[PDB]
């Protein structure tokens, strides 16, 4: 019986890691096995280089950057498959979608360019979307800006067009543990009923 | 007056190292303002993962190695496009057609996947092909067994259907200065006649 891919995403200060901590925490305590990922992975070689980037310690060009990012995912494919198919439900703290968005908030930058890399990967078997006005969001590194923000916005919102993945939007300007719940039984649903097929394939 | 820029590609051993050495050196000795290039470049923080991988010092999961080859031509691209701009022929032992190549040659990776990081590189003038039987190229790392060499030189074949690019045939097989001469006719004609257009970009 494997485990469920859940990805959350959102705008930056929507409460993506906060819930991402406590979801695990609670499907834990409920009794299921369930583990927390994060990209970018800063861990790797190739995560180090990406947070210097980020920390503006580095600069470095805009299409390699974004194929880092990628590649910062495929590395951990064979880890997300092995538990994934041992019955480990992972909570992921942005995926793809957050790459595809950021790059392509850049100019000259085409939404299809920016999901080729990521064609193939894991497809989340539930991808959640943490709303919250962007003006909420600043009263809670690279791409800091309102500006760069609002962008980024639109590009997840030409992503949620598509119907081939499972989109649940989350209010997220309720308090931590009222939207907590929400994610959590969207959670268990998605554990329990989108397991039942086999684990599928990104934007393919 | 723009620089041409021009590719060197073949199966290993074909002799596109050498021949790129004796173009720039033959180019200059003409006047012309010429510069080598190669991929991968393993100079940068990029490149030192990948020429660790090449040794087998370091394991890289398939889809990442392919997008940490892509990036680092990616992050030479300021560079040629500013010596391009200033008059710089650049010569260049391997591109983008290696890179859709060897991946190529894996199992489940189509030749569409593999061609999108690349989509956008700076588009050569002229692609040479050094053609050597792969029995002749075994007279004279990772990928260095034949039954590798043969897939990846399928691959080749099949990028060479594009008509979008000026691919020249070379018959690698003569001597190293008959098969330089040929490659600096072609050469010449390139710098003189392709620049005349605009730099263009790559599968696209
Ligand atoms: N629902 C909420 N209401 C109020 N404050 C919250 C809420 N959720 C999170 N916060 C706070 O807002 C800040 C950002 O939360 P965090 O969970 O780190 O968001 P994030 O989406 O991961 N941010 P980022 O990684 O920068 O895009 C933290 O100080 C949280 O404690
Ligand atoms: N035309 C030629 N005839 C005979 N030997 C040659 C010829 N061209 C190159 N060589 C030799 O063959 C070997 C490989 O040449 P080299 O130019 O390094 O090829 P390459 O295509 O860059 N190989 P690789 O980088 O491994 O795919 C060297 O020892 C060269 O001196
Ligand atoms: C996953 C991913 C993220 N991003 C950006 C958005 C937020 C920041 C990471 O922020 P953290 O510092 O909170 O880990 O990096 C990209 O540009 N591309 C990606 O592929
Ligand atoms: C440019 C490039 C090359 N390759 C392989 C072929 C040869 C070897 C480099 O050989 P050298 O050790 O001679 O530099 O690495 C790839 O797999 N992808 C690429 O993008
Ligand atoms: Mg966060
Ligand atoms: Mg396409
Ligand atoms: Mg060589």
Same mark, same amino acid.
């Given at each position: 019986?494997?485990?469920?891919?859940?990805?959350?995403?959102?705008?930056?200060?929507?409460?993506?890691?906060?819930?991402?901590?406590?979801?695990?925490?609670?499907?834990?305590?409920?009794?299921?096995?369930?583990?927390?990922?994060?990209?970018?992975?800063?861990?790797?070689?190739? !995560?180090?280089? %990406?947070?210097?980037?980020?920390?503006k310690? $580095?600069? &470095?060009?805009?299409?390699?950057?974004?194929?880092? @990012? +990628?590649?910062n995912?495929w590395?951990?494919?064979?880890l997300?498959?092995?538990?994934?198919?041992? !019955?480990?439900? %992972?909570?992921?703290?942005?995926?793809?979608? $957050?790459? &595809?968005?950021?790059?392509?908030?850049?100019?000259? @930058? +085409?939404?299809?360019?920016?999901?080729?890399?990521?064609?193939?990967?894991?497809?989340?078997?539930?991808?959640?979307? %943490?709303?919250?006005?962007?003006?909420?969001?600043?009263?809670?590194?690279?791409?800091?800006?309102?500006?760069?923000?609002?962008?980024?916005?639109?590009?997840?919102?030409?992503?949620?067009?598509?119907?081939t993945?499972?989109?649940?939007?989350?209010?997220?300007?309720?308090?931590?543990?009222?939207?907590?719940?929400?994610?959590?039984?969207?959670?268990?649903?998605?554990?329990?009923?989108?397991?039942?097929?086999p684990?599928?394939?990104?934007?393919?």
């Amino acid at each position: 019986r494997r485990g469920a891919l859940i990805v959350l995403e959102g705008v930056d200060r929507a409460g993506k890691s906060t819930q991402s901590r406590k979801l695990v925490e609670a499907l834990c305590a409920a009794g299921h096995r369930a583990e927390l990922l994060r990209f970018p992975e800063r861990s790797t070689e190739i !995560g180090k280089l %990406l947070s210097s980037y980020l920390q503006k310690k $580095s600069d &470095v060009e805009d299409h390699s950057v974004h194929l880092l @990012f +990628s590649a910062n995912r495929w590395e951990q494919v064979p880890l997300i498959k092995e538990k994934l198919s041992q !019955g480990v439900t %992972l909570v992921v703290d942005r995926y793809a979608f $957050s790459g &595809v968005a950021f790059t392509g908030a850049k100019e000259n @930058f +085409s939404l299809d360019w920016c999901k080729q890399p990521d064609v193939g990967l894991p497809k989340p078997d539930l991808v959640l979307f %943490l709303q919250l006005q962007l003006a909420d969001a600043a009263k809670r590194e690279r791409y800091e800006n309102g500006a760069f923000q609002e962008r980024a916005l639109r590009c997840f919102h030409q992503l949620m067009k598509d119907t081939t993945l499972n989109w649940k939007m989350v209010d997220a300007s309720k308090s931590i543990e009222a939207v907590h719940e929400d994610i959590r039984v969207l959670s268990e649903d998605a554990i329990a009923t989108a397991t039942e097929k086999p684990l599928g394939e990104l934007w393919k």
